[PDB]
Each structure stands twice: as C-alpha cells, then as structure tokens.
Design a protein around this ligand. Structure first.
Ligand SMILES: Nc1nc2c(ncn2[C@@H]2O[C@H](COP(=O)(O)OP(=O)(O)NP(=O)(O)O)[C@@H](O)[C@H]2O)c(=O)[nH]1
Ligand SMILES: NCCc1cc(S(N)(=O)=O)ccc1Oc1ccc(F)c(Cl)c1
Ligand SMILES: [Mg+2]
Ligand code: NA
Lengths: 469, 167, 166
C-alpha cells in the first residue's frame, strides 16, 4: 500500500489533492493551476523529479509568491515529521528487542529523503541560476545561508556542504574548441589603423564576424529576470532590463549606421558600391547564423530613406537582389520562414530577440493570473509554463559560443558607433529622409549628379575567406 | 476567394496596447491566449454582410526596435494608432506615428483609425473631446476601447476595414 | 526536429556533469559540486538531421541511489560513465546497466559505455577490459575527456544514433 503521511494539521503538504487546490492538464502530470502549497509540493515531489518544473517555477514564481515567502515555504516543506512506532515495533520494544521499524525506514527512504533532497535541489538551482533574488535582498541571502548551514544528518551532508560553498563562490563572482578560429581578414584598413576604419575599408568578412561576436555577447547576456513580468516595457525598464536594452540599442544603431552610410553617399556609383557591400555583409551574417545581423540589414534596406532609392536598386547585381529578397522573405507571414530556419540550423546562432519579446508580452497580457474554481483562487500555472518555454528557448541558444577571434580595435569601432551623434531620433531620421530626397528626388524632378567622396578603391575583396599557410 | 486585409497596430509601449488584438482574436468567451500559435492573429469576420479575413500585425513589446518600424509598417493596408487614455505622452506620440505611416506608405490618405484604450482604473488624463478633436483634425475616426471588457474592440477593427473599403 | 531524451548515469565524481557542461557550453568545470538532478537542452545537427537533445544529468552519490527509477523511466538512451582512473566506478557500471534493463523492462535499451578522464596518465581501467564489457552489452565504448573535449561529441552523438536506429 501507499505510505501513510503526517497529519495535514501538523504538515500542510500532506493535504489530499482536490480540484479545490490543484488542477492537472489533460508520464508525469502537468499542472494547469494550483495553490502555492500544492505547487511547492509538486516542485519537490517524493515520487519523481521534475527539473523542467524547477526551472519554470524558479523563473516565474515572483508573479505569485515573494522570494521571502518562497524560502519560508520550502523550509516548511523540508521539516517533515517522522511517524511514531507501529504496533509491531511497540511489541518488540516491550519485550526488550530492537524493533524492525519497517514503516519508519520506508518513510525515511521513500518520502523524507527524496523530498528533502528535492528541496535542496530547488535551493541549489535558485542560488546557481536565479541569484539575483539574493543580490537584491541581503537578508534573503542570510536566511538561505543559515538554513543550508544548519541542516543536520548524514544523508544530506554532501549536498549541504556543497551548496554552502556554491553560495560563497556566487557572492564574490573559459571556452575550449577543438578547431582553431579562422584568420582575421584585412582589406584597405590595416591592423592598428583605427582612424581609417569604415564600412568600405574594413574587410566585409571581418565586419560580419566582429559584429557577430558583439551581437552574440549581447544576446548571451540577457537574463530571464529582464523578461518576466514584461519589465522591459514598464517605467523601470532601464533598471530591470539593462542588458536587453543594450542589445536592442546596438541593433538600432547598426541599422541607422547602414542607412546613414547609404544616403550620405551622394554619388550614385559610390552608393551602389556601399549597398553592394552591405548585402555582402548580410551574406556573411547568413553563413554565420547571425539572424539579428540579417534583420539589421533587412530593416535598413526597408527603411523609408533607403527603400525609395530606385536608381540604386536598379544597378544592384541580380544575384544580390535575390539575396536581399530571400532574407526579407524570412520576416514575411509573421516570421514563418525565420522560425523554421532558426529551428533547423546548427548553432551557434544569434536569434532575433523581438519575436520572443512579443510572445512573452502577449502571453502575460492574454492569460489571467488566477483561475477561480469551487470558490477558490488557484494560481494559473499554465500561463507561467508558457512564459518559461520562451525563456528556455532563449537560454538554449545562449549556450553555444562562436569559434571566431576577437579583433579588439574592430570591436571597439563597432561598440563606439554613434550615427545619431547628439541629435534626437526625429531630427536624425528626418535628416536621413531629406538626404534620400536630395540624392534621388521624387519624380518628375530630374536626377542630379554628385561628386565622388571616396579616394580609395570601391571594389569589394568578396566574402569568401582566404587561408595562407 | 475572400478579401484579406492586412492591418497594423501601432502605438506607445507599456500601456496595454496588446489587449486590443488579443481581445479581438481571442476566444471571446475564454480569457486565454497562445501567441506562438500559427494564426493567433488571423480571424475571419463578417463586416456589413461581407466576409473577409483580417491579418493583424501587432509587434507589441518591440517598441525599442525603432529602426524596424518602417519595415513593419509597410506591410499594412490600414493602421490602428493606439494611445492609452491615462497616458498623455502616448497621446502626444500619435502625431509622429501618423507622419511616419504617411511617409512609409508614400500617401497623404492612408486608412487609419485613432484608438483610445482604457488599460486600467488609473485616472484618465486624455479627455474624449481632446481625442475627438485630434481625430477630426486628421479626418479619421476615433474609437475608445476597454482592455478588460472588450468594449469598442470590434468597432475599432471594423471601422478600420470600412475605411479601407471606402478609400 | 526530433527530440531525444538522453540520461547520463554513473558513480559519483566520474565527470557526468563536466561531460555534459562541456557538450553544452564548451566549458570545463573544475569544481566537484555533486549533482542532485540537472537538465539541459541542445539543438544540434547530427548526420544532417536537426534535433533537440534533452540531457538529464543525474546523481552519482550513493545517498541518492533510491531515486533512480523515476529518471530511468523517462530516458530513451543512457550514457553509462565511469572514470578510467577509478576501478570502483567501472565495477559500478553493471549495477546501472541492470537497473536500467529492469525499469524499462527491456534487453535492448540504447546505451553507450563512456570511460572518462582519458586526459589523465594514471589509468587503472584498461581499454580492453571496458571494451570487453561493452561487447557483452552490445554497445559501443568511447573514451572521453571533459577537460580537453576528446571524444565528448562522439559519445553523445553516438547515443543519439543508437536511439534513432532503435
Ligand atoms: N582531469 C579530468 N578531470 C575531470 C574530468 N571530468 C571531470 N573531472 C573532474 O572530476 C570532478 C568531478 O566531476 P563532476 O562532473 O562533478 O562529476 P559527477 O559525475 O557529475 N559527480 P556527481 O555524481 O556527484 O554529480 C571535478 O573536479 C571535475 O573537474 C575529465 O575528463 N578529466
Ligand atoms: N523596389 C524595392 C526594392 C527593395 C526590396 C527590398 S526587400 N523587400 O526585398 O527586402 C528592400 C529594399 C528595396 O529597395 C532598395 C533600394 C535601394 C537599393 F540599393 C536596394 Cl538593393 C534595394
Ligand atoms: Mg554531477
Ligand atoms: Na498622463
């Protein structure tokens, strides 16, 4: 038979499941809704582990439970009473014999030790992967240190001593490849001559590689704490979502830099060379699975100042028109082809983050926090699972590093890019559009001619890599 | 077959804009949503006796990708310009959204509707007369909607489709 | 995208977590933090087909030995890891093999035998003895180093191929 449990009057997590406290979805069960007590019971269940549930819960719980209250509840979960001696044990003791204590030994082995170990696994994951709760609340950290540091008894000892050390290391807080990264490529600008760096003077292969390293690092730095609760859209977004915002602002700045490079090149022949070089960079982004970079280029080409430049488009080689068109097709029909491509490639990649943001925001806005059942309010956990499925997909693409060498000067050049200067956004984007009108006026105004601005060769070195011995 | 209208929702972030399309496309009568579901933004409707398909683009949450607005906007035949009635800044933003739509579509007469959205019980700061005056100055309809009761939601989208049909 | 549920099992300290983190992050973990249960996901193209690996990293410490049935039920394939400088961990392999067979009620569970820490010179388990055991199980034997990456992709992706051909 099943093990008997402590009385629900002395141990709250022994209350029977009912539709008034837990609802399952239609081989472990999937929880649709429940009380916080039932969620924590199933988070630390004696019959099975649910590591995905642990991640989901620790990512999303603050929308229904405060960090201080979560710690109190898992400490309460941990402190399980042992059963009293049974009749057979009593009779043995009355005869001066050692009791078999069969029921007690089974309850320790099959209920207490698994639940306690799974409570410690929640603590371990909380400290390792959600440490911001403790960075933001020093007293919460003190309580966790005291709880872990006072667990007695040999069965938990190895993990208690380990978690103590992990906490201490987190308080004061290296990649291997088997292949070598390819050689850094140079074009007109030579190493160390940062003052000559520009769109046409750096090697287009190396522009795409260094932007991919930069954009990959920005992508990998975004934590779920910047996303849950839609906090990047709220008044405190600069406080709560700084890595996400830095990533988006880089993308915006690069898009505007591409547009500025195009429309400030007034000579038609030179501007064709500029656009052709940008489409070559897009081709290397595609080869690197840098989808953020692909869309930076696509967004620039579809901007109002660039899209209208029919005389420039006419002179772009057909094969490059096709590269740009197929890249734009990734975004059509609500990113249908992009989503399929992302799910088919071999990482490393740099996803486009915007789709994730829209899906997290709409999941949060479109589902209720609670479900009302039998007069009780239950936490709608299905909604949190959906959010954590998105943050989990984000995290899965953050693991794989690019096997590309950083060039510190090219990296600094792109980190310091500032096409808007001191201008505000409207002033700057009106400037770009007015440049577009200047260099290719609206029909029936005639097309003017403009002098060349570049003193160096416009011929691209191409995007196939070279390899000296 | 039936006409498909490509509609685009634009407006300031952080003030409940996404509730408009969610409430439209939703199972009206079950408060639930999975936006990742292929065609969670397509809806067949009957407007003035004529069946059509609405394809709604709402990039809510991507407002900081400001250089992508042109590309997103060019996909649209008609636009809902949304502000929150308790956020005066979102109302003041409307002028620049409209100017950007006109530039991207290269037209002074783009089908669009102005939508004032009530996203919570915080105090209203934009009176309906102010929004009506702005809409009249642009020659476009004004619809107010609730983010919680679905009031006005159908009117906002159906009015926009009528603006497209009568363009 | 086909999804594959891989489970990494073996005695405490043999390098199950280091192997998994090297596969997932290309990083070698120097610390010895005993695992309770961890899970990882990895999208990867294997033999031209994209799939999604779900990797369960399990507890080797004996204090967790009563909690294994639950993860053996869910796993589709098992990496059975010992360390080539620890003879006791090699002798522990057969206990994992037998429990997996009992739980899944099957003589034919996808498995790979992994001899880890092959970067260390002080070997105490000879390759021949491990290969003999693998042949008796009908499974491949792959020596690995979580430190240098030697054999790591081969071990995990061989297990995927075993599940695919099951
Ligand atoms: N030299 C060397 N050390 C290794 C290798 N793999 C793991 N180690 C080291 O061995 C120790 C234990 O590794 P770990 O991955 O934690 O082992 P585990 O099997 O997961 N232990 P547990 O069962 O308790 O979770 C760590 O100090 C780790 O750095 C390897 O291939 N080479
Ligand atoms: N007639 C529209 C052609 C066009 C298509 C795309 S798209 N939708 O394929 O991404 C993007 C931009 C774009 O306009 C351009 C203007 C100047 C150029 F130098 C080039 Cl190359 C393209
Ligand atoms: Mg481990
Ligand atoms: Na206001």
């Amino acid at each position: 038979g099943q093990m008997r449990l402590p009385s629900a009057d002395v141990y709250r997590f022994a209350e029977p499941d009912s539709e008034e406290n837990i609802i399952f979805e239609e081989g472990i069960p999937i929880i649709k809704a429940g009380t916080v007590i039932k969620l924590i019971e199933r988070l630390t269940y004696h019959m099975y582990a649910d590591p995905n549930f642990v991640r989901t819960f620790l990512t999303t719980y603050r929308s229904f439970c405060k960090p201080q209250e979560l710690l109190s509840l898992i400490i309460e979960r941990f402190e399980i009473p042992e059963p009293e001696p049974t009749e057979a044990d009593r009779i043995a003791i009355e005869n001066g014999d050692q009791p078999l204590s069969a029921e007690l030994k089974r309850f320790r082995k099959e209920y207490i030790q698994p639940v306690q170990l799974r409570v410690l696994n929640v603590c371990r994951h909380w400290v390792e992967h959600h440490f911001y709760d403790f960075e933001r609340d020093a007293y919460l950290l003190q309580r966790m240190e005291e709880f872990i540091g006072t667990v007695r008894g040999k069965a938990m000892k190895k993990w208690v001593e380990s978690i103590t050390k992990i906490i201490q290391r987190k308080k004061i807080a290296n990649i291997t490849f088997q292949s070598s990264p390819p050689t850094v490529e140079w074009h007109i600008s030579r190493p160390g001559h940062i003052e000559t760096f520009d769109l046409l003077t750096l090697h287009p292969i190396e522009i795409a590689r260094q932007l991919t390293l930069l954009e990959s690092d920005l992508y990998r730095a975004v934590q779920p704490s910047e996303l849950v609760g839609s906090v990047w859209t709220k008044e405190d977004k600069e406080i709560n979502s700084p890595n996400l915002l830095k990533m988006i602002r880089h993308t915006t700045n690069l898009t505007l830099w591409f547009e500025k490079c195009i429309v400030e090149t007034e000579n038609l022949e030179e501007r064709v060379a500029v656009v052709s070089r940008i489409i070559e960079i897009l081709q290397v982004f595609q080869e690197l699975n840098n989808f953020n970079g692909v869309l930076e280029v696509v967004s620039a080409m579809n901007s109002s100042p660039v899209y209208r430049l029919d005389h420039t488009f006419e002179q772009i080689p057909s094969r490059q028109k096709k590269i740009l068109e197929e890249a734009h097709e990734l975004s059509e029909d609500h990113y249908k082809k992009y989503l399929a491509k992302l799910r088919s490639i071999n990482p490393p990649c740099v996803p486009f983050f915007g789709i994730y943001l829209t899906n997290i925001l709409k999941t949060e806005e479109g589902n209720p926090e609670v479900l009302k059942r039998h007069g009780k309010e239950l936490i709608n956990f299905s909604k949190r699972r959906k959010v954590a499925e998105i943050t989990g997909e984000i995290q899965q693409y953050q693991n794989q590093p690019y096997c590309l060498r950083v060039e510190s000067d090219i990296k600094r050049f792109f980190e310091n890019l500032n096409p808007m200067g001191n201008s505000m956004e409207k002033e700057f984007t009106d400037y770009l559009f007015n440049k577009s009108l200047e260099i290719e006026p609206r029909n029936p105004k005639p097309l003017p001619r403009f002098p060349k601005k570049y003193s160096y060769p416009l011929k691209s070195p191409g995007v196939r890599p070279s390899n000296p011995r | 077959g039936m006409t498909e209208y490509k509609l685009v929702v634009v407006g300031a972030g952080g003030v409940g804009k996404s509730a408009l399309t969610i409430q439209l496309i939703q199972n009206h009568f079950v408060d639930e949503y999975d936006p990742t579901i292929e065609d969670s933004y397509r809806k067949q409707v009957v407007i003035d006796g004529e069946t059509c398909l609405l394809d709604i683009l709402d990039t809510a949450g991507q407002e900081e990708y400001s250089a992508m607005r042109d590309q997103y906007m060019r996909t649209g035949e008609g636009f809902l310009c949304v502000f929150a009635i308790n956020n005066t800044k979102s109302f003041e933003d409307i002028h620049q959204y409209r100017e950007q739509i006109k530039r991207v579509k290269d037209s002074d007469d783009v089908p669009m509707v102005l939508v004032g959205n009530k996203c919570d019980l915080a105090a209203r700061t934009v009176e309906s007369r102010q929004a009506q005056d702005l809409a009249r100055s642009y020659g476009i309809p004004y619809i107010e909607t609730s983010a919680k009761t679905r009031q006005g939601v159908e009117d906002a989208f159906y009015t926009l489709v009528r603006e497209i049909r009568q363009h």
